[PDB]
Amino acid sequence: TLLRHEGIETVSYATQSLVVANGGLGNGVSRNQLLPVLEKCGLVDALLMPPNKPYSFARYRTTEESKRAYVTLNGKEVVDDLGQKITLYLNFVEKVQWKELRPQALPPGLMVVEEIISSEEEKMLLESVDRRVKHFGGLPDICESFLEKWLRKGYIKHKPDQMTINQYEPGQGIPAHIDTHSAFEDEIVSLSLGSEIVMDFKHPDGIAVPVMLPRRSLLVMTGESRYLWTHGITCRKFDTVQASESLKSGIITSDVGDLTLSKRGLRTSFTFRKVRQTPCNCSYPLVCDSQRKENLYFQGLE
């Protein structure tokens, strides 16, 4: 399913150990949560839960008990610290090992302009609007002033003709996705204000880059970062960041310094896109609705 990119080898025969997909700490599943469910099938000799991973490893005393878990727990639902439902998927593993990845680069074509606006400029926009969502496109002069500067500065190359307002509350976010190709051009920028947050960007092949969007920052995503990748916001109330560069934006790597968590706040976003007139024709037909419009096969795959 995903374990492929994760470097986890699975076998088709019963074994004492098995990987538990979606049963990891990085998914919101606690040891006090999973361990009980696991023991319900046998004597759990070990529950290995690697940090920041959407999975954990379980090992039973006998290979028979393990098979019981594989056939009874597979598909079982559990509630994370986010008060959400998540199904578990177990698989037999001969050995317990996985790959650790630490992206050093933002998805190509993505860039976060820090302190794009001032404090008063932030306060203003916030008190001039009134999961909460709001569409446009049209564009209120309230920002026609800013956009103009955006272009001159060079941060943006095209003036948008549509804008969406998103207001997220501590806990709520938005599931991963990719803005429609045939709907907007190759340039979608997003101004985050009120309270910093962490946007997740994922590549189909497997790469996972958790980008931290600070307040008063303009996330501009173009190219691959806007056509192939996928942006989302894990619904949580606490984001983990690096001690020093906590307020700074970028990739939140680990093992390079002491780590500390931060509480979320009422974040409001202003996404700007230019509605496309022609049909999209990028280099990513795997996700481009326009380029795969007339393909019975793709159609079947919905």
Ligand SMILES: O=C(O)CCC(=O)C(=O)O
């Ligand atoms: O939260 C953001 O800044 C991204 C906006 C977004 O995902 C959308 O509404 O299409």
Ligand SMILES: [Mn+2]
């Ligand atoms: Mn979006």
Ligand SMILES: [Zn+2]
């Ligand atoms: Zn496309």
